[model samples]
Target: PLPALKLALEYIVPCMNKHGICVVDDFLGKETGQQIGDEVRALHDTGKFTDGQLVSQKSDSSKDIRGDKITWIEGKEPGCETIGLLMSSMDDLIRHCNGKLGSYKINGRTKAMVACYPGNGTGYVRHVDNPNGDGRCVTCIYYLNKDWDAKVSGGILRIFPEGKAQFADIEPKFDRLLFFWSDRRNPHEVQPAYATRYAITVWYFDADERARAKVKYLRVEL
Candidate 1:
């Protein structure tokens, strides 16, 4: 494992316990992250991405709550080249963070997606990953927005720390990974993007549940 990742895991545990959010810059390194981003762009160009949907029972079932193009990363074999590089990093993450932090240990591959938020002022609203059930235990988002600037004034991930009156706004910069608990206590939202945003979102669950979910994931488009 990379020293930065090792150190980041050490930092991640305590931080998540205290605040519910943690970020590691260069989590997958610049080269690998860019490569994965390129793959996502290629998929987008080929029209592989579909409109993002809202799973909220509180809102209209027919509405697309998030204005982003998304597609599932169907396979996650660790040695599959570019996508492999991403999975390898994610696998490393699973090894280190699972059972060390959170309520359950991550054991198998969980659902992941390559999502793109394009155009001005497009983003998802405030939400939690496992809002209804314990489907998702943790969320790992690797940002791929190269040359992103804070001056763009949008596309920032706003995380509400426990007990804090104000929240922390994270810039969606290249090669950063945002890790957090996917529960009610950590409500988060993405600010509108000024240009384009790219990211791979991965989630984890308890080992048994994850395996059970993977069976269904083989057929689900998302």
Candidate 2:
């Protein structure tokens, strides 16, 4: 865990408590996130991304609900220095999970991903991170789209308030970190982007929640 994340957590926790959603700008320091974005873009250019599949309790990839491409960052891929740096920062967030969501029983352990949604009508529809159980507690998404503007249109994350038809739209701006509950209360979807939309998502889980329900880890395979 990186020591540089204390301030980020200081802000993130309070935001989550107030509104099931939180957004942090410059989460990785502007240049740091931009560098990582460049690396991931290069990876995508090489055709490294595979079909992004959505997972339910059964962990089946047959439901192609997400219209995007994805590549998992395991920390050691070549040209992954910036990715590694950002990942280390995320580890710090995990270390402080209990402090943030202990009352809700989540400890912030789960999966991560680098998802790329190419413009021209590609997006991920509204869906909960943990569909079958309360194992998933929170989701962290950091945007990497450079020079994102409303003129680019689409690719905005639309979050729904419980029982409310009017949703809040968030632009996919560079260095912006989005955090939200991974439950039924905070349903969200991404509009089809006009250009490539890059983002990193880390889904947190409560190991205790899974064990109590006798369910597989949300990160497990189908």
Candidate 3:
């Protein structure tokens, strides 16, 4: 694992185990984040990303639910070496967490979803990442907006933690990584963005859940 990632897991794993959510700032430093950001922006320029959709809805009519445009990163594309490195490090982190956290049993992960929420007061509605089990055990998101000012830009990630009456709001600052349980323990939403906002997400799947329930490991088209 990268030294930074190793250092982050020390705090992240314990926090996730206790609070079901955790955030780490400057995860891989600003330079690396800018590199990945540049690549994602280049990809975005190609006009390959599609509008994010809701789980039950197939048409673009669900824009009110999720306004981001998205593309998937499987770590196989050129110019995305930084993203691939991040994915590999996250794999190691998952392995470490599975052993340390014991009951998680994470054995698989989905392709990273590189999403861009175009500025225009666009935001996603509140929802759980995985409401039906479906093997999704961990939800990890990394923000890539440079010099982001949450107060000015909006697009804060607001999460409702189980057993808590108040919601916690997180800034989508550059190189910040956020992790939370995929189940009902965390119901999160993206606030409106006044400027372009970028985020990449990957969901780790639990082996036990897949084996016992025969559920699909893919996430929604967003």
Candidate 4:
């Protein structure tokens, strides 16, 4: 058993929302995750990305910097449809798992699109995700390399715990899903893993009730 997995077994999954480094292994499991992984990679590789942005430095706070990021492709059949369905499903999962759903706004609006990340050697270097110019609510990475291991060619995701930044390491297990919240407590980076990182990323906001509410608190968005 993974050393860190004990927490989940005991139902003691840590909430590092404020302090940092909240990770859940097997949260999505291997079966469903592998199928989703294959689908994402196939679509992400279909087109070309006009520009590849430096996501880590883009954030205002050091604690807010994230590991993986790339631009999403918009509007196309099959591809876009997959993204839409997947993202909507993500919305449902977030609501069920987290007990509330946040607004999945993109460029200030809510719309999910297919994203392509190249093993063609293009991806962000050592950064976390930031939502709406604020702290990144949660970071999600869905894997897609069949028989993938950490021994490939470029880009790696490395997460670090607060006050222990120097001790971080890269993880390259494929068919896996990683989620995290970038906050003051945990800061992370992704080293070039030697292969392409394939995944789906989704962000969220409160439900319509709180979105329309003045200072809504303690309300379950789920």
Compare the candidates by TM-score and give the number of the best one.
3
Candidate topping lDDT: 3
Worst 10 residues of 2 by lDDT: 55-64
In model 2, what lDDT does residue 36 have?
86
Rank by TM-score (best first): 3, 2, 1, 4
Q: Give the better candidate number (1 or 4) by lDDT.
A: 1
The TM-score values for the models, in the order shown, are 0.79, 0.81, 0.87, 0.56
The digit string of per-residue lDDT tens for model 4 on 35-139 reads 556556555455433334444464466434333335564324454554454554444444444532123331222344334444544445444454233523555
Clashing pairs in 3: none
Model 1 lDDT tens row, 1-222 = 356456546787778766778888877677777777777777778777786544334556555344677877754533225765666677676677666776676765555687888744777788877765445777888888888985764788888765679988988888888888887777888888878788788886667556665565644477
TM-score of 1: 0.79
Residue 7 miss distance in model 1 (angstroms): 3.2
Clashing pairs in 2: none
Regions more than 4 Å wrong, model 1: 52-66, 76-80, 208-222
**Selected candidate, larger lDDT, 2 vs 4:** 2
lDDT by residue (1-222, candidate 2, tens digit) is: 224456546766776787778877777776788798889889888988885544233456454354588888876788877877777677676566555653565555544588888675767778867767757777878888878985655798999867767787899999887878887878888887878788888777676765765655425579
